[PDB]
Structure formats: structure tokens, C-alpha cells
Amino acid sequence: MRFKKHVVQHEETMQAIAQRYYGDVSYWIDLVEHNNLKYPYLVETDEEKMKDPERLASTGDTLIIPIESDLTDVSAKEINSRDKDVLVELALGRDLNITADEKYFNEHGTSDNILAFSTNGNGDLDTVKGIDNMKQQLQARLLTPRGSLMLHPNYGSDLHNLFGLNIPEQATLIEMEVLRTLTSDNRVKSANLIDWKIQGNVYSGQFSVEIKSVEESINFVLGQDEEGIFALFE
Amino acid sequence: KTRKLTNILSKLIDKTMAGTSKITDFTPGSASRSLLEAVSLEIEQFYILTKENIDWGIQEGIIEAFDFQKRQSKRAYGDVTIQFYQPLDMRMYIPAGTTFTSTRQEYPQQFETLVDYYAEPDSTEIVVEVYCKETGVAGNVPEGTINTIASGSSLIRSVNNEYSFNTGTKEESQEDFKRRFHSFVESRGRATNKSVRYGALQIPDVEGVYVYEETGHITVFAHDRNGNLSDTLKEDIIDALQDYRPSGIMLDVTGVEKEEVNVSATVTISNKSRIGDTLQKHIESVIRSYLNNLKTSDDLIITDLIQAIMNIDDVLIYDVSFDNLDENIIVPPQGIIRAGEIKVELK
Amino acid sequence: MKTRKLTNILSKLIDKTMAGTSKITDFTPGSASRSLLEAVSLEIEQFYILTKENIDWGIQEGIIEAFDFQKRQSKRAYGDVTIQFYQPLDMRMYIPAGTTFTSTRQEYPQQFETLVDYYAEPDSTEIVVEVYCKETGVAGNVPEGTINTIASGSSLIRSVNNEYSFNTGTKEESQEDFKRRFHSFVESRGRATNKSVRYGALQIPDVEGVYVYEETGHITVFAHDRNGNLSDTLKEDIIDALQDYRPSGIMLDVTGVEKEEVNVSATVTISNKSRIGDTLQKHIESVIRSYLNNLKTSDDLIITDLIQAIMNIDDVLIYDVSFDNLDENIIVPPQGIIRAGEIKVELK
Amino acid sequence: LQKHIESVIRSYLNNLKTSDDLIITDLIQAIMNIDDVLIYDVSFDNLDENIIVPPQGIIRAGEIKVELK
Amino acid sequence: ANFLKNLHPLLRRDRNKKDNQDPNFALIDALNEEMNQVEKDAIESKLQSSLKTSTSEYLDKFGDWFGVYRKTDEKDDVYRARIIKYLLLKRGTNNAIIDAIKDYLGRDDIDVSVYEPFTNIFYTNKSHLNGEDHLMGYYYRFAVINVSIGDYFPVEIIDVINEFKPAGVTLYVTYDGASTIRGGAIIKWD
């Protein structure tokens, strides 16, 4: 359950609150009954509240409005930018950093024993969040051979076998495999080719990845509020 | 019974139209309509105020005249002392809502100040008033409970509540208020068997009273916890009942017809090693308590006594028998049973 | 509430308006400002009036609530019915509760039933059984001779008849009687007095009136129902109620009033002889029954008072009245009462 | 209530093992512990003294009857 | 008194500086005065709904409900005290009769007592033969009382006692003329 809570403003009235929330002043008596207020409902200052602290409320006190509120179906324009950042951080998840030392496992991408855990410098395990978490997950999926991970036959990629000839056919095979790998992730909305080239022994390419927008992540997390898990099991 | 906002506004508009035709625009946003709506809202609020006052008066106005106060639910409140390491170098400010707590699991109640406070530079320790955030007796913390401030400056040496909080109260229900008032009204009664019995029972040392009525005479049977009626207590009862008895009627006081029952019991026991004086005295004490617990009109059922003696222990106590107790000793309403000489034989 | 009136409020508003500005000086009839202030002041006047009325109502409600002195509701009529057999019984027949009694007289189609079982002994010729009207209110106050049917269908029944008109049925209590009994309550908070004994006897709703006859060391409580009877159950209930109120050590006895049943046969002459019929006879009989049953305890019957009561029905239509069974006034003692018996009227 | 008390008595009698002596007071407390308040007094119309069972004997319930007053 | 708060927001709440005779402020303040006065009256009206704090007309309503009527020039405090006392009257004993006698009369210092002749019934054993006791009969009988009054009384005081005495007790009244003698009652010859 969840209800709205209203702070008493300067020289406010119960009719104004009822109009603001319920859309009609008629509910001010219901608001009085629910909050158990005496006739001077909103006193000028705390000196008057001292006369009867139980039954009276002064400026700065909090009233309860029993309207069933729900975090979903809330306009994202009202949400603060920091709140949006935290929401997308929750949506993309938090995971222990393993892709530290980018140079090492970029030099030995196809081999095992390439990545390892790391510390955050404060004595605790390192963590990657949001875009860093997505980077880590996508790098791990691309580097992982398909079928090598226990309990997950489909997770990984076939790039270890696509060290073929230097022709456009193998380049297309690589591109298709990479697109399959990126599309395998549920968070990746779509991926597509940008540009590629061949320099004899070396193949080079780059891709564009469009993660789920801020609106979709906000909606997902705020809908998760009904369950309270706030965790990812994709 | 009462008008309402729409009705008041409609009648105001109708009366305004009747009074003059110079105004005809009563649409939303009109200055005249806004004025009439404000007046109508004020009048509706006054109507609600009158309704509240009358509702209070219906259920408290009459009884309040007889010095009877209904117990309202209150937040526990009281004074706390804050000590500073030294006289204050500047004017310190404690805003309203500053929280005070206690470092115990026994008392998770939170207290807060409902008003702003100021401590002068010359002061070294200032007392403030804090209110419990929850209504009820839960805020009635004992002395030396409140010992922390959640937003205080480091200049504080210590925090302490000098006295226990006792102002927290639960709301008294209306039926209990009516019951107290009716009990008082009944107590105002006089010159009846009920009123005489009541007035006798208000005496401190009287435990039970039976009033027997005869034409032209009243006799009162009274007893203490021991089933006795001392001469001093008899005189006290007489003096108290001088005010109660009817005019032209004779009243007498007498002691309850006490009947001391001597019980000699043979108790068969399983564990022969546990036979000893202590178990004997325990059984004797149980029997004595059973016999002395009986009220004025309670008859001594022997089967219930056997049940109690066997329920002392379900396996150890094997069997019981009595030579004195052959059949249930019936007694009248004015004859109480009490414990006499008791003996227990272990077999 | 100080009970202000409209003119003073309007005058005060206009005076303050004039004081606050010299520009506004037109408060004639038909002006906007006068109309607005008149409307406001009228609403205030109505608020004050309704507040006063609501306070009066709330005082009554608080009186009711504080002492739990609930107002008495409408009472269902009840009475007794006589039943006769062909010959004295041999079987001890059983009549369970709920045995319905009805009347063929369509003018009074109300139904009655027994709330308690009854037994008729062998070698018994008739039985009296108490019955209660199914419907509440005055509708159960049928006249004598109305009930003449029993729905049990037993063949042993010869005839059914209620020997007296029922009167116990009444509507909801009036305000004046409620206030009267509240005064009796206040008076009888002192338990042992005569007024308190009278209240305790009247504490039972079914009791109509009580006369406390007092002697040295003895009390006699003459009590009666609306019909002038005092059943054993009601006597026991009165005694139980009086246990709390009666003085201790003084003998008390409860007995029924010395009820006297009057039979009236009236010969009446009518100026307009076309008006003769069953309606006029029944109306006059109803008036006579109402007059006789409205008599309280210690009320002496006066023949001239009955004469004027009959003649005031219609002084022109009714020409003369003569009684075939009454010739002199009846003196009722303090402990007696008159109730209607068999009422008959002959139209000439 | 009659059937419940009869069932309790039957259970108590049938639960007796070999060489278990019937004691009337034990049966009294077993009956009274059903409800000490509701039950006021108990009296037996066919038993007056305890029954001694030898090692090779046993007691079993016969006809159980209860009268409510 | 929320008239200014719930007023149309564009309207001025304060007397304008440009004109000391601002009719808008005059009209608003006039209406606000009436609104505040009605609020004050409504707040004060709570006193009339309670028997403890009621006054003239509503107190008369209360006393009419309780069956006690205001006397000539009887003020509210004594009237409510009389109502409360009338509700709480003890009845059926010697003390109640004495209190009623001393209340109906204008003073309390008068000597009043209730004599119970059944205390002086001649019993065979305990009663002295030539003592104060009398043989049992009509007067020396239970359910009989003789009230001694040491002051002039109206005959209606008997009816007053009839209101308080228990039912079934015969009443007698004795007038003690010694208590009402002017000055010292001892007569001198020398």
C-alpha cells in the first residue's frame, strides 16, 4: 500500500488541499475525519499547536491523504535528473567488475584466464554500474565462446571459429555473428553495422548499440515497485 | 438540519437577483459569485463547527457537571535536561522537531520538541519540553530513559530526563464513562437491601455481606477474610449503616455462622522414597487453601476436593480417603465454611 | 447564539461600509451593495436560527443519551379470548403457541395469535387464552365480539368470542409523556419514597396507572393494564421491579384494581332519517367505547357528560338520546376504574 | 454431554493394562477434569469400593450409563 | 475566519497606498468583521450545550428537562447548583428528613431530631420495669416516627416530609416551644 503525504503550506486551507488532490473541495470533511483534526485545522504557528498538539496541526506538519498512489503512471517530467540516473542504474543493474585491465584481455581475447576481479580502492570488491555494467556484460558475452559456459549453452559467441580467410564472405559472417550476439542480450534494443575494412591479416569493424531508453527503464523499475524485487533475472 | 455549500450559494444568488436586476452574470470566475462562494464556504465551516460542538455536548455536557472527566488520549510529555561542557560562547538555537531518543531496546519511543528554544550565552544548562511522537501509555518512559539527541551540537555533555513520564493516557470509551456515571447514581440510592449491602461492602475490612429481610426488622450477616466479625468491625458497620437504614425500621448486625470443617485424610502415594514432612505440609496447605477460599454460600463438594488433591500430582498421589467427610456439607447462604484442624496421613 | 436579527446585521454592515469609505453612499432599495449585504445578513440570520434549533435538539439528545432513557416505541395490542366446546372434554387437548385467531368481521381484519401454550383440562367447558395482535399499533384495538374464528380447525370448538374490547394497542410515545416519565425518574432516584414506588411499578411499560395505598407498616400497590386487568405475569414483573425501589422491612402487596364493567344501551333519535344505517350506529358505539376507555382511575362516570359527548357528534342530525340501562351516576373509588363492556345503540 | 462423558469413561476403563487396579478416586478426577466448572458433583450408582486386579487379570468396560441432573 | 484566504486570489487583501478611502478594502473588511464575529459566536456557543457552563435560556431548558424551575431573581450558578442537588437527593432516612427540614427553613442551626418509639418497646428481660420503656401498642410500634422541630414551621412542612419519608411509615411532628423563646427562657421571681 502507499498514500500521498502533504506538508501544510503557509496560510493553506483544507478546501484548497481537497481541490488540489481529489479535484473537489467536498472531501475536506473526509480529510478532517481521517486525520482527526479539531476545528482550527491549520494553525498559524506552533504556539497555537501547543494548546492541543494531538488534535491540531501547524505549518510544516505532514498530513496524510488516503488516495491509493502508485509510482507507475507517473509523469517522467516530474522525476529529478538524479532520480532518473538512479532509476536507469537500477534498470541496467550492478555487477562486480571483472573487465578491469582492458589491455590485458584485449591482447588475449580468445584465450581463457583473461579477466579477474578487482578492488575499488576502499577495501571492498569493485563494482560496475549502468553503462559500465552494460560494457562489462557485452564484452563478456562477445569474449565468451558459445556453449563453454556451464548451465548456459547459448551464452557466448562463435568468433573463435571465425578466424577464416580475408574475404568479404568471412567479414559478413563475422558481422552476422556479432549482430546475433548483441541481439541475444534482452537490454540491447538493436544493433547494426557502421563500417568495416580488411587490412590483410587484420580485420577491423565497429558497431552501434542502442540500449533501452530512459523512459522504458523508468517504467520498468517503477513497475517493479509493486513486487519489490528490484533485481534482474534476465 | 443544516444547509450546505451549493444550497447556500443558490439562495444567495436568488436573493441577489430578487434584490436587484443590475447584476445578471453569475458564471464561474465572476467577482460577485466568488464573493458569495467565499461567504458560503465560511458559513458551511461554521455549520461544521456547530455540529462538532453539539456532538461533544450530547455525550459530555450533562455528565461533566458532576465533576466527571472523560480521559482523552494524550501524548506523553515532560522536561529533559541538556548540559553543556562550558558556558555557551554564542546563542545556540534548537529548531522545532529536534529529536530525542534513548539507547535501549526497551524504549524505542522517539520524543521531539514542538517549539523553538534558545539558550543564552551565559547559560550552562537549559531545560526543554519534549513530546512523545505516539499517543498512549507507550510514551510513559521511566526516569533516566531519554539520554540522546539526534541533531545536537558536540558542546552537550549529557542529556537526561529528570523525572519519569506519566501523562501518556489511552482514550476512555463512552460506555465506561456511562458505567461510572450510572455506578455513582446507583450509589446515591438509600434505604434498600441493595443499598444497605453496597454501603456495608464499601467498608474496608468487610469481604462479604448477606442481608436477610423480615417485616419490621433487618439483620446483616458480615464476615472478614477469616470468617470472623470483630466487635470493632461490628460497631463500624452499625455506624456506617445508621445513614442507610429506613426510618422506623430496626437494623441488627451479626457474624456469619462460621463452620470449621476438620478433615483427616489418608493419602496413598506411589513414590515411597519421596514420603516426608514437606509433601505432607504441602498437601495440608492445599487443603487449607481450598477450604478457606470458599465463599459464604459455597457448599463443600467432597468430589471436587478429591479432584484438587489428586490434581496436586497425577501420578504421585495414588488414592485418598476421609473418615470425617462422609457426605457433602450443605450450608445456608448466611453460613460460611472455613478450614479447621487438618491432618494428612501418607500411606 | 445571541439571537441577532436581520435589520441589525444589515445596519452594522452598512455602517462599517460607510465608515471605511466615503465614496459608497447609495444603499437604496435595488442597489447592488444593499442586495449583496442583505443576502449575506439573511444567510447569517438563517445560520443563527438553525444553530439555536440544533442546540435545542442536541440538549434533548444529550438527555436521552446520558441516562440511556430510551423512548418507548409502539405497543402491540393484546387481550384474552373465550372458547367454548360442545360438551365437557375428556382429552387434555394441547394448543401450541402461534395458534392464529381471526375475525370474519371485515371492518376489523386484524389477526391475533397465542404466544404461550395452553392446556384444557378434562371435564372443562371453556378456556380463556391470552392472545397478541400480529400487527403493532392502534389497529389491534378491536371492539368486543370481533374475534369469532380460530384457525386451528379443531372440531371440539363450539364458538369463539372476545368478551371485551381491546385497548392495549397504542402508537409511539408522545413527547409530553416521555418528559413526564423522565421527571418521575428524577424524582425516584431516591428509592424508598412513595413516588419512587409508583415509578418502579410504572417502570413496566404495560402498566397504565398505579395507585399506592399506604398504611402503617403495610403498602398496597393497586396496578392495572390498559384494559384494567392485572395478569399474574405482570404482577410478578411489577414485584421484581419493585424489589429495587420498595423500602426494606415494610410489607408490600400487589393487587389489581377494582375494575367495574359498564354496559350501555342507548336509544337515539335522528332528525334526518335517511342517515340511518350501520355506519352511524358503529360510529356512535365507537365514540362511546372511546369515552368509556379514556376514563382514568378515580374518574366518576357522569351521565350528562356522556350525553353531551354523544350529542356533540352532530347536534343537528342527532335529535334525542335515551339510555335503557343507566339512570344514575356511578362513583368510582380511588382504587377503581370503569371500562367499556357491551355497547349497543338503537337508531330510531 | 452424556455421550462425551460415557466416551471418556470407556476410554479410561479400556486403557487399563493387566495388573492395573481400579481406583474410584482416579475415575472421579478423570470425570471431573472434563470441565471442573460445568460439572458440579458426581455419584456412582453401582460402585462403592476399589477393585483389586491380580497379575493375570484385567478390567474392561461393560455397559456405561450416565444420568444428567 | 478564512474569508481572505478563500477569496478570489486577484482581489486585494490590503488597503492600497494610493487611496486611503479604498472602497474595496472597506467592503472586504466589513465582510471579514461579520465572518469573524460569527466564528466567535459559534465558538462561544459550546458553553450553551453543557450543563456546567450553560446560561439563562439554555439553563432554563436544562432545568425544565430536569423538572426544576427558576425562582424569582435566581441566578445561573445557584440555579444549576440547585438542579444538581435535586438530582442527588438522599431519601428514606432520618438524615434526609433532617436535611429537608433545615433546607426548607431558612437556617441550619435549629435543633431537629427524629424519635423512633420502637426502640422503647418493653421487652420482658432487658427493659427495666419502671424504666423508660412502654408496652407495645399503636404508638410504640415499628414504622412510626416522631419529628421534633425547635422552630416555627408551616403545616406544609409535613407534606415536605411526605416527599422524603419512606412509604408505609406513620408520621408525627412535635413543636418544641422552648427553642423559640425570646432570649433566656429561665423566668425569675427574686
Coordinates of C-alpha atoms in Angstrom, one line a residue, chain A:
Chain A
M1 CA 0.0 0.0 0.0
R2 CA 1.0 3.6 -0.4
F3 CA -0.6 7.0 0.2
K4 CA 0.2 10.6 -0.5
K5 CA 1.6 12.8 2.3
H6 CA 1.1 16.6 2.2
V7 CA 3.1 19.2 4.1
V8 CA 1.0 22.1 5.3
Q9 CA 1.9 25.3 3.4
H10 CA 1.7 28.9 4.6
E11 CA -1.9 30.0 5.1
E12 CA -3.2 26.9 3.3
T13 CA -6.8 25.6 3.8
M14 CA -8.3 22.1 3.8
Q15 CA -10.6 23.1 0.9
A16 CA -7.6 24.1 -1.2
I17 CA -6.0 20.7 -0.5
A18 CA -9.1 18.8 -1.3
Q19 CA -9.5 20.7 -4.6
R20 CA -5.8 20.1 -5.4
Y21 CA -5.8 16.4 -4.8
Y22 CA -9.4 15.0 -5.0
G23 CA -10.4 17.6 -7.6
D24 CA -13.3 18.8 -5.4
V25 CA -13.5 20.7 -2.2
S26 CA -16.2 18.4 -0.9
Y27 CA -13.6 15.9 0.5
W28 CA -12.3 18.3 3.1
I29 CA -14.6 16.9 5.8
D30 CA -13.3 13.4 4.9
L31 CA -9.7 14.7 5.2
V32 CA -10.6 16.1 8.6
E33 CA -12.1 12.8 9.7
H34 CA -9.2 10.7 8.5
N35 CA -6.6 13.0 10.1
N36 CA -8.6 13.5 13.3
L37 CA -8.4 17.3 13.4
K38 CA -10.1 19.9 15.6
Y39 CA -11.8 23.0 14.2
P40 CA -8.8 25.2 13.8
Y41 CA -7.3 22.7 11.4
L42 CA -4.2 24.6 10.2
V43 CA -3.0 27.0 13.0
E44 CA -0.7 29.9 12.2
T45 CA 2.3 28.7 14.3
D46 CA 3.3 26.2 16.9
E47 CA 2.3 28.4 19.8
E48 CA -1.4 27.7 19.0
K49 CA -0.5 24.0 18.4
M50 CA 0.9 23.8 22.0
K51 CA -2.7 24.2 23.2
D52 CA -3.7 20.9 21.7
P53 CA -0.9 19.0 19.9
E54 CA -2.9 15.9 19.3
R55 CA -5.9 17.4 17.5
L56 CA -4.2 20.4 15.7
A57 CA -1.6 20.8 13.0
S58 CA 0.6 23.8 12.4
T59 CA 2.6 25.0 9.4
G60 CA 5.2 22.4 8.4
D61 CA 3.3 19.4 9.7
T62 CA 2.6 16.5 7.5
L63 CA -1.0 15.4 6.6
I64 CA -2.0 12.0 5.2
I65 CA -4.3 11.9 2.1
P66 CA -5.7 8.4 1.8
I67 CA -5.7 8.2 -2.0
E68 CA -4.1 5.0 -3.4
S69 CA -1.0 6.3 -5.1
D70 CA 1.2 4.2 -7.4
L71 CA 4.7 5.1 -8.6
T72 CA 3.9 3.8 -12.1
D73 CA 1.7 6.0 -14.3
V74 CA 3.7 9.0 -13.0
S75 CA 4.9 11.6 -15.5
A76 CA 8.6 11.3 -16.1
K77 CA 8.9 15.1 -16.5
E78 CA 8.4 15.4 -12.7
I79 CA 11.2 13.0 -11.9
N80 CA 14.5 14.7 -10.9
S81 CA 17.6 14.1 -13.1
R82 CA 19.4 12.4 -10.2
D83 CA 16.3 10.2 -9.7
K84 CA 16.4 9.3 -13.4
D85 CA 20.1 8.4 -13.1
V86 CA 19.5 6.2 -10.1
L87 CA 16.5 4.5 -11.9
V88 CA 18.5 3.7 -15.0
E89 CA 21.3 2.5 -12.8
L90 CA 18.9 0.1 -11.1
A91 CA 17.5 -1.0 -14.5
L92 CA 20.8 -1.8 -16.0
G93 CA 21.9 -3.5 -12.8
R94 CA 25.1 -3.6 -10.6
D95 CA 27.7 -6.3 -11.0
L96 CA 31.2 -7.0 -9.7
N97 CA 33.9 -5.5 -12.0
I98 CA 35.8 -8.2 -13.9
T99 CA 36.7 -6.3 -17.1
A100 CA 39.4 -4.3 -15.3
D101 CA 42.7 -4.2 -17.1
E102 CA 41.3 -3.8 -20.6
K103 CA 44.7 -4.0 -22.3
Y104 CA 45.4 -7.5 -21.0
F105 CA 42.3 -9.3 -22.1
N106 CA 42.2 -7.2 -25.3
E107 CA 45.6 -8.6 -26.1
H108 CA 44.4 -12.2 -25.4
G109 CA 40.7 -12.1 -26.3
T110 CA 40.2 -15.6 -27.4
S111 CA 42.1 -17.3 -24.5
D112 CA 40.9 -18.3 -21.1
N113 CA 42.1 -16.9 -17.7
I114 CA 42.0 -13.4 -19.2
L115 CA 39.9 -11.4 -16.7
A116 CA 39.7 -11.2 -12.9
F117 CA 38.0 -9.5 -10.0
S118 CA 39.4 -6.2 -8.7
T119 CA 39.1 -3.9 -5.7
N120 CA 37.6 -0.4 -5.6
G121 CA 40.5 1.1 -3.6
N122 CA 38.4 1.3 -0.4
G123 CA 38.9 -2.3 0.7
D124 CA 35.7 -3.6 -1.0
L125 CA 35.1 -5.5 -4.2
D126 CA 35.0 -3.4 -7.3
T127 CA 31.6 -2.7 -9.0
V128 CA 30.5 -1.5 -12.4
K129 CA 27.1 0.1 -12.8
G130 CA 24.9 1.4 -15.6
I131 CA 26.9 2.0 -18.8
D132 CA 29.9 0.3 -17.2
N133 CA 27.8 -2.7 -16.3
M134 CA 26.5 -2.9 -19.9
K135 CA 30.0 -2.6 -21.3
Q136 CA 31.2 -5.4 -19.0
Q137 CA 28.3 -7.7 -19.9
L138 CA 28.7 -7.1 -23.6
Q139 CA 32.4 -7.6 -23.5
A140 CA 32.0 -10.9 -21.5
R141 CA 29.4 -12.2 -23.9
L142 CA 31.5 -11.4 -27.0
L143 CA 34.6 -12.9 -25.5
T144 CA 32.9 -16.0 -24.2
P145 CA 32.8 -19.0 -26.6
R146 CA 29.3 -20.3 -27.1
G147 CA 28.5 -23.5 -25.2
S148 CA 31.6 -23.2 -23.0
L149 CA 29.7 -21.7 -20.1
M150 CA 28.1 -24.3 -17.8
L151 CA 24.3 -24.2 -17.4
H152 CA 24.0 -21.8 -20.4
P153 CA 24.5 -23.5 -23.8
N154 CA 23.6 -20.4 -25.8
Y155 CA 25.5 -17.8 -23.9
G156 CA 28.7 -16.7 -25.8
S157 CA 29.8 -16.2 -29.4
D158 CA 31.3 -18.2 -32.3
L159 CA 34.1 -15.7 -33.1
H160 CA 36.8 -18.1 -32.0
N161 CA 35.9 -20.2 -35.1
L162 CA 35.6 -17.2 -37.5
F163 CA 39.4 -16.7 -37.9
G164 CA 39.0 -17.6 -41.6
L165 CA 40.2 -16.1 -44.9
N166 CA 40.5 -12.4 -45.5
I167 CA 37.5 -12.0 -47.9
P168 CA 34.1 -10.2 -47.7
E169 CA 32.3 -13.5 -47.1
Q170 CA 34.1 -14.0 -43.8
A171 CA 33.6 -10.4 -43.0
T172 CA 29.8 -10.8 -43.4
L173 CA 30.0 -14.0 -41.3
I174 CA 31.7 -12.1 -38.5
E175 CA 29.2 -9.2 -38.8
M176 CA 26.2 -11.6 -38.6
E177 CA 27.7 -13.5 -35.6
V178 CA 28.3 -10.2 -33.8
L179 CA 24.8 -9.0 -34.5
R180 CA 23.4 -12.3 -33.2
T181 CA 25.5 -12.0 -30.1
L182 CA 24.4 -8.4 -29.4
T183 CA 20.8 -9.2 -30.1
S184 CA 20.9 -12.1 -27.7
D185 CA 21.0 -9.5 -24.9
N186 CA 17.5 -8.5 -23.8
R187 CA 18.5 -5.0 -22.9
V188 CA 20.0 -4.3 -26.4
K189 CA 17.1 -2.9 -28.4
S190 CA 19.0 -3.2 -31.7
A191 CA 22.5 -3.3 -33.2
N192 CA 23.7 -2.6 -36.8
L193 CA 26.9 -2.3 -38.8
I194 CA 28.6 1.1 -39.1
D195 CA 31.8 0.4 -41.1
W196 CA 34.3 -2.4 -41.7
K197 CA 37.6 -2.9 -43.6
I198 CA 40.3 -5.5 -44.2
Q199 CA 44.0 -4.8 -44.0
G200 CA 45.2 -8.3 -45.0
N201 CA 45.8 -10.3 -41.8
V202 CA 43.8 -7.8 -39.6
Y203 CA 40.1 -7.4 -39.7
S204 CA 38.5 -4.2 -38.2
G205 CA 34.9 -3.2 -37.5
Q206 CA 32.8 -1.1 -35.3
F207 CA 29.1 -1.3 -34.2
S208 CA 26.4 0.9 -32.8
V209 CA 24.4 -0.4 -29.8
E210 CA 21.1 1.3 -28.7
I211 CA 20.2 0.4 -25.1
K212 CA 16.7 0.8 -23.9
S213 CA 15.7 4.4 -23.5
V214 CA 15.4 6.2 -20.2
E215 CA 11.6 6.2 -20.4
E216 CA 11.5 2.4 -20.8
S217 CA 13.9 1.8 -17.9
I218 CA 12.0 4.2 -15.7
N219 CA 8.7 2.5 -16.5
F220 CA 10.2 -1.0 -15.8
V221 CA 11.7 0.0 -12.4
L222 CA 8.6 1.9 -11.2
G223 CA 6.5 -1.1 -12.2
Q224 CA 8.9 -3.3 -10.3
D225 CA 7.9 -1.3 -7.2
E226 CA 4.7 -3.4 -7.0
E227 CA 6.8 -6.6 -6.4
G228 CA 9.8 -5.1 -4.5
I229 CA 12.4 -7.4 -6.1
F230 CA 14.4 -4.5 -7.7
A231 CA 16.7 -7.1 -9.3
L232 CA 17.4 -8.6 -12.7
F233 CA 16.9 -12.2 -13.6
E234 CA 17.0 -11.9 -17.4

